[PDB]
From Swiss-Prot, chain A:
Beta-D-fructose binds at residues 19, 45-46, 49, 262. One of its GO terms (molecular function) is fructose binding. InterPro entries: Ketohexokinase-related, KHK, PfkB_dom, Ribokinase-like. This is Ketohexokinase. Catalyzes the phosphorylation of the ketose sugar fructose to fructose-1-phosphate. Changing residue 44 to R: In FRUCT; loss of ketohexokinase function; insoluble. It comes from Homo sapiens. Pfam families: PfkB. Homodimer. Most abundant in liver, kidney, gut, spleen and pancreas. Low levels also found in adrenal, muscle, brain and eye.
Amino acid sequence: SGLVPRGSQILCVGLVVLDVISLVDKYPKEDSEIRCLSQRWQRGGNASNSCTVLSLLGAPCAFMGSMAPGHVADFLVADFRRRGVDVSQVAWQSKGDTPSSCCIINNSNGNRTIVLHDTSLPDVSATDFEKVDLTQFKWIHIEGRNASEQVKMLQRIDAHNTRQPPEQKIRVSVEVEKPREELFQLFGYGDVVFVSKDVAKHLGFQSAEEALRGLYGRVRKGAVLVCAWAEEGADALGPDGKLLHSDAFPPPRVVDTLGAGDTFNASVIFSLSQGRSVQEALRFGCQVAGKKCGLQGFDGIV
Amino acid sequence: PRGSQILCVGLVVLDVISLVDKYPKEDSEIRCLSQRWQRGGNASNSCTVLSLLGAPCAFMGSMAPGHVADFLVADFRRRGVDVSQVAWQSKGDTPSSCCIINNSNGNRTIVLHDTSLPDVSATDFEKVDLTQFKWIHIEGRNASEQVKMLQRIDAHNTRQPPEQKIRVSVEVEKPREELFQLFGYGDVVFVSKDVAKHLGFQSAEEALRGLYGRVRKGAVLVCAWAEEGADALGPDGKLLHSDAFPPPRVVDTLGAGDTFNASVIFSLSQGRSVQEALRFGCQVAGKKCGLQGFDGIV
Ligand SMILES: CSc1ccc(C[C@H](C)C(=O)O)cc1Nc1nc(N2CC[C@H](N(C)C)C2)cc(C(F)F)c1C#N
Ligand SMILES: CSc1ccc(C[C@H](C)C(=O)O)cc1Nc1nc(N2CC[C@H](N(C)C)C2)cc(C(F)F)c1C#N
């Protein structure tokens, strides 16, 4: 690790997982031995994907998440470095496995069957976050996971900001992506709150407009709540009460939407960290995520 | 030392294992109980079991340099498996499999990523000093090349007294027509239940009686059949059977067939009768079925 200039990096806190994806002619019957058509090992995880996009956008970025020493972590660290991501804040654990998932894709109907990673590896704790020198960062994005610990991380960032002039305050964003009640306390933290379409629909909202008007009462004073809604584009709502919208920028052909939400989040964060307005950041998020949907992976998103 | 090692020729594959409570239905998401990496491949698993049984053993197979091969080589060396005969390739990736093991019944589902890594050739085998080995086991893969390897061993044996002859075993594990020429080679032929069922046989007894005509004169044909135990048939025409030794809780059968094969080979290499070797094979493979991996078999 070398010298990182003060207030230069965007940190994403969350999951990194090894996804082993196998394409098969037909779903294997239990207890059978089959050969796949093709296989690929990929680095996944919401915060992990957002770091890849931030590096491709030209932002110095860092990932913070748990990993256990071993060959799975070696593959993931080499893949983070292949995408220019700084991994010096990784919380190395002495117990548990580095997450790894198995995804079987049936080439005859596109069905995806997933065997998700085990929960043995401890999540990043508030005590792990206390050890991080914050001066390095201009923005910290947190993927909502172990909410009670992440609330203490957010309170530490808020305390840091009270002693800084407006120019050296660290901007904060949070993502509430899973419909887990424990995560809903995270709406009250951060300057920017991203809420997924899946969370909005599980809370009874049928559109991004409904979700933002119905959930704005939960954010802290001054915060911007953002909700992307696939082909329907994305909306944002700030303290002035004006609903902002951008239409989607769909590709000529949709080929891969995995990580489109992480691409949208990273692109909104990047645009706002560059001093752009919320309307401009919302449009930029739709532009980059729409372009990504027409490409396999993140190469060529620009 | 001369005639001290057992050589296993075949594949070495990285098995990326997920242990689950139940097999996932198509298009669903389930969470695994635990994850692990295991050095797999049929010949490779048989070397693990031979080293655990206390037999000096060597592996011969293709590998490509890289971090996955570093894990596999370190695992072979940790078990004292001799890797000096490995055919290192400059092209192709290390094969890897996603293995889903059902913890409630030991069922193992494997999705193999077979890479364009070149197989061990007859020219690679020509370079092997055979004096080192008392037994050579071949996992059926590139049959036309492996037939030349077997012919080289047969030619070597014609110039040796009975005490210095190398015993040979072959495994016909996949129902691929190209592999059926391998039945006519070796002193011991292992035929899988899957091959037997694909050729119309519904039991180990049916398979041995129906396929014995394919083995060379004097050979022993062996067929394991999961909970139904295993059978063997030699030149005297007497069918031999062993009941299985199932554990009270079956938790992992990945590599049970390789454990059975290695244990039969070990017992026969120690001078035991075919009946005793068949029982020993069932005993060790049955013990393995009640454990995750191969540790604790001894
Ligand atoms: C506005 S950019 C954005 C931001 C976050 C997300 C992800 C998030 C989970 C969500 O769905 O809201 C997606 C996108 N954007 C698209 N997503 C799409 N899908 C998502 C899955 C859907 N299939 C059917 C199951 C298809 C299709 C398109 C299409 F027009 F090309 C676009 C775009 N453009
Ligand atoms: C006689 S030892 C042996 C030798 C070769 C094999 C593997 C070979 C492919 C075959 O199944 O013939 C298996 C075994 N043995 C067991 N396999 C079992 N399988 C249930 C799920 C798996 N399925 C059918 C493939 C395997 C269950 C038991 C149970 F009784 F504990 C035992 C034992 N004991």
